[PDB]
Write an enzyme that holds these catalytic residues in place. Structure first.
Site, PDB file in Angstrom:
ATOM      1  N   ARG A  23      39.739  19.479   5.948  1.00 27.13           N
ATOM      2  CA  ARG A  23      39.343  18.728   4.773  1.00 27.13           C
ATOM      3  C   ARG A  23      40.591  18.097   4.163  1.00 27.13           C
ATOM      4  NH1 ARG A  23      34.843  19.705   1.913  1.00 27.13           N
ATOM      5  NH2 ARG A  23      35.789  18.073   0.600  1.00 27.13           N
ATOM      6  N   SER A  74      20.739  43.562   0.153  1.00 22.55           N
ATOM      7  CA  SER A  74      20.160  44.254   1.306  1.00 22.55           C
ATOM      8  C   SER A  74      21.028  44.452   2.537  1.00 22.55           C
ATOM      9  CB  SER A  74      18.866  43.576   1.744  1.00 22.55           C
ATOM     10  OG  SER A  74      18.373  44.225   2.902  1.00 22.55           O
ATOM     11  N   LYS A 106       6.348  44.160  -2.527  1.00 23.46           N
ATOM     12  CA  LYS A 106       5.708  45.274  -1.825  1.00 23.46           C
ATOM     13  C   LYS A 106       4.203  45.305  -2.078  1.00 23.46           C
ATOM     14  CE  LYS A 106       9.645  48.469  -1.908  1.00 23.46           C
ATOM     15  NZ  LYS A 106       9.679  48.540  -0.421  1.00 23.46           N
ATOM     16  N   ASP A 118       7.932  53.526   3.335  1.00 22.68           N
ATOM     17  CA  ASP A 118       8.613  54.063   2.160  1.00 22.68           C
ATOM     18  C   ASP A 118       8.221  55.512   1.892  1.00 22.68           C
ATOM     19  OD1 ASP A 118      10.361  52.038   0.947  1.00 22.68           O
ATOM     20  OD2 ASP A 118       8.527  50.872   0.627  1.00 22.68           O
TER      21      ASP A 118
END
Ligand SMILES: O=C(O)C1=C[C@@H](O)[C@@H](O)[C@H](O)C1
Length: 498
Positions: free
Chosen positions: A37, A247, A296, A334
């Site tokens: 760049r 996550s 969920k 779960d």
């Protein structure tokens, strides 16, 4: 379209000596090329500096001299800007990126003067959204008309559903095409290039050297997302949620897929609207998903078939797209993950009435002593659905009880947030926290200081994770492998993938 996607590294150091060092780092990291760049150089002696970079760079070079009017740093005379790019080409550059706006004039100026290995990239940037296929097609056509060797289009993701349009473009455009969607909601477009015909993707030297929103690091592309293994037939999976950057499902599942050589890839899926999302990605290319807050409970509604355990619980954290017809099957991992983690640690006080709360509540009921629910919104009939309490009262509540947090309180970056006063913990023998990022939440911390035993959310995370693997691949859960992967690759804190 053709060869697997290349991995290009943006070099923006403000001095020539530092850019040279960066190109070396890029080589070390595994990048296929580097984009210099030029507009970022504090001092710039074209002839001399350009000569140096081309010489010292261990990788193919792509030069860009981005002007302020295109979001770059260069200001000044346009002809001088163009002269530099022409110089780069004649000095041996492998590519140059020229803006659509001036591509016609430019390509005409180099007519009959293009080196043998030289390729001209013509780019367009859309900082507002991702146009319709109709408009994208027109843009591709326009870029082609300038005489570009490679079509380059960068759009902005307003919603994750926008990526599908970009995939259609890179996948069906009969010309080398670099298509990317910026923003966290477009990240998937930067990872799945090799599956949808993208010619190149940008990866950073490190989390701080980003030239556009959403760019992942080269290391993560290669080691976390197993970039080189992604191909046209690779099946896609991902964690659905909002937020989702914390996550670690992408870390564990990708390692496992690679370990057993399963042709799949797992990514982060930042979803605002679950219904439209599932609609936007119903093709066989997307075989399964994991679901976390706040989808969920909603996933349950979108599934065509629900596992008795999932129906009985009232929420789905695992979705599988059946190859047969193409419908969605909902499962819940779960419950078993939470319950087993807790029992192993060894009346249950459940904090939170969402999908995770439902599962943990159900399992606690089905296996021994009874439980009471405590949610921010008192109403969340949960306690009567399995046999209640308002959050603020939790502080005010035996001496060997069990506490289980299933809410997001304490999850990064809300590290100093706890769902209960450390004074109450004195009455619990064990305390579980579904939050695994960080591993040691304030809750678990003050709990161990409270003399009680603590069960990390990672215990529940790994367990529910290998059960999803089995569901996704149809292969027996490699439990030992998942514990190993989590220990060796999922230990670092404060990581955000976006
Ligand atoms: O953080 C994550 O990636 C996950 C968290 C839990 O809600 C799990 O139920 C989900 O499948 C994955």
């Amino acid at each position: 379209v053709k060869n697997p996607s290349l991995i290009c590294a943006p070099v923006m150091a403000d001095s020539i000596d530092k850019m040279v060092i960066e190109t070396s780092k890029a080589h070390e990291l595994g990048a296929d090329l580097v984009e210099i760049r030029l507009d970022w150089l504090k001092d710039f002696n074209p002839l001399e500096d350009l000569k140096t970079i081309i010489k010292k760079s261990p990788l193919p070079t792509l030069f860009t001299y981005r002007p302020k009017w295109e979001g770059g740093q260069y200001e000044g005379d346009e002809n001088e800007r163009r002269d530099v790019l022409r110089l780069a080409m004649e000095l041996g550059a492998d590519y140059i990126d020229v803006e659509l706006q001036v591509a016609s004039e430019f390509i005409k100026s180099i007519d009959g003067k293009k080196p043998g290995k030289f390729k001209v990239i013509v780019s367009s940037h859309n900082y507002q959204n991702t146009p319709s296929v109709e408009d994208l097609d027109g843009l591709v056509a326009r870029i082609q008309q300038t005489g570009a060797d490679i079509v380059k289009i960068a759009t902005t993701a307003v919603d994750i559903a926008d990526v599908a349009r970009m995939f259609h473009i890179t996948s069906k455009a009969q010309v080398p095409t670099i298509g990317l969607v910026m923003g966290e909601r477009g990240l998937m477009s930067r990872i799945l290039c090799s599956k949808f015909g993208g010619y190149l993707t940008f990866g950073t030297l490190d989390s701080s050297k980003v030239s556009a929103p959403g760019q992942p690091t080269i290391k993560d592309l290669l080691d976390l997302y197993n970039f080189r293994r992604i191909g046209p037939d690779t099946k896609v999976y991902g964690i659905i949620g909002k937020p989702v950057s914390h996550s670690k499902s992408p870390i564990v599942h990708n390692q496992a897929f690679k370990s057993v050589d399963f042709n799949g890839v797992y990514v982060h899926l930042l979803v605002d609207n679950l219904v439209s999302f599932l609609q936007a990605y119903s093709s066989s290319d997307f075989a399964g998903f994991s679901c976390t807050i706040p989808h969920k409970e909603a996933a349950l509604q979108c599934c065509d078939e629900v596992d008795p355990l999932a129906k009985s619980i009232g929420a789905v954290n695992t979705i599988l797209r059946r190859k047969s017809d193409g419908k969605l099957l909902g499962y819940n991992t779960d419950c078993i993950g939470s319950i087993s983690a807790i029992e192993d640690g060894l009346t249950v006080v459940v904090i939170g009435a969402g999908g995770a709360g439902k599962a943990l509540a159900y399992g606690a009921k089905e296996k021994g002593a009874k439980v009471v629910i405590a949610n921010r919104t008192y109403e969340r009939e949960l306690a009567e659905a399995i046999g209640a309490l308002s959050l603020t009262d939790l502080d005010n509540y035996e001496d060997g009880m069990v506490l289980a947090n299933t809410t997001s309180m304490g999850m990064q970056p809300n590290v100093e947030e706890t769902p209960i006063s450390k004074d109450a913990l004195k009455h619990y023998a064990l305390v579980f926290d579904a939050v695994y990022t960080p591993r040691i939440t304030r809750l678990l911390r003050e709990a161990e200081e409270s003399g009680a035993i603590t069960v990390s959310g990672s215990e529940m995370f790994v367990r529910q994770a290998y059960e999803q693997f089995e569901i996704f691949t149809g292969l027996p859960a490699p439990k030992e492998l998942y514990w190993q992967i989590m220990s060796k690759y999922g230990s670092r804190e404060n990581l955000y993938f976006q």
